[PDB]
Amino acid sequence: SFSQAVSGLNAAATNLDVIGNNIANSATYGFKSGTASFADMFAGSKVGLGV
Amino acid sequence: GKLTNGALEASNVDLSKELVNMIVAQRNYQSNAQTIKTQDQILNTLVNLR
């Protein structure tokens, strides 16, 4: 199906958004960095649902 | 069975299974309709004998 591919595409876009934000804020004086963390999914079957 | 939010179910109909049944049915229809023609030809030739 297309659903696993769509979920992988959607997950890898917030990971670029939170790097673009870190790049842009690299000169403010009290900033703290940000990091995203991914985790798999599983329904009742044994094949995945994406990320 | 346990619930999981944020999901729906598919239709459980696979096209790779179901797009050969119509080919089989079309061939069955044609093989059945051949018998009507082979019956009508003999019924018309067994009555114009005289």
From Swiss-Prot, chain B:
List where the protein spans the membrane: none
Location in or out of the cell: Bacterial flagellum basal body
Q: Would you identify the family this protein belongs to, as annotated?
A: Belongs to the flagella basal body rod proteins family.
Protein's recorded name: Flagellar hook protein FlgE
Organism, scientific name: Salmonella typhimurium (strain LT2 / SGSC1412 / ATCC 700720)
State which stretch of the full-length protein is shown. 354 to 403 of 403
